[PDB]
Write a protein that binds this ligand. Structure first.
Ligand code: ZN
Ligand code: ZN
Ligand code: ZN
Length: 178
């Protein structure tokens, strides 16, 4: 197994996947690494299993259809993984914890949002459809773009949103387009 966490790329107290060579800190894995279970399979392995059990799940989908899916266990898992993939980028640090807004010439968003809040919401099963999760994720970056206006810092929101969107299209097998 790897000697660094897959998500944050640091050593420490790591839990090792039994079915692939990835390792995780306890709270870097999503969901948090489970207490017992030997063997243990990581979220990357669990996602691969879903695809292997239903190869047709990789045929292209319409986003509108994906968003209306109820958050049954497989969709819950896919959202957990998608959230994890965003945490895997180091620029996610900017969007992880609760922001505050005090900049001359801007007003903060009406509905602040951040990754750790989405993480809690997933953990507490607060989303009933995929749409709920996707709307909160997109709101994080939209709020950032709106607040930072022409500061070049706006680009961080564009960057992390692109990681979100690419991973969304991959995980939920959205039909490729030009
Ligand atoms: Zn970590
Ligand atoms: Zn694994
Ligand atoms: Zn099948």
């Amino acid at each position: 197994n790897s000697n660094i966490c897959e998500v944050c790329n640091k050593w420490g107290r790591l839990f090792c996947c039994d079915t692939c060579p990835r390792s995780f800190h306890e709270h870097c894995h999503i969901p948090s690494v489970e207490a017992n279970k030997n063997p243990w399979s990581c979220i990357f392995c669990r996602i691969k299993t879903i695809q292997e059990r239903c190869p047709e799940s990789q045929s292209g989908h319409q986003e509108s259809e994906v968003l209306m899916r109820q958050m049954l266990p497989e969709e819950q898992l896919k959202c957990e993984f998608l959230l994890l993939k965003v945490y895997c980028d180091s620029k996610s640090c900017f969007f992880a914890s609760e922001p505050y807004y005090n900049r001359e010439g801007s007003q903060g968003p009406q509905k602040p949002m951040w990754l750790n809040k989405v993480k809690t919401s997933l953990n507490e099963q607060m989303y009933t459809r995929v749409e709920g999760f996707v709307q909160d994720m997109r709101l994080i970056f939209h709020n950032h773009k709106e607040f930072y206006r022409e500061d070049k810092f706006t680009r961080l929101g564009i960057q992390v949103q692109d990681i979100f969107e690419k991973n969304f299209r991959n995980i939920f097998a959205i039909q490729e387009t030009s």
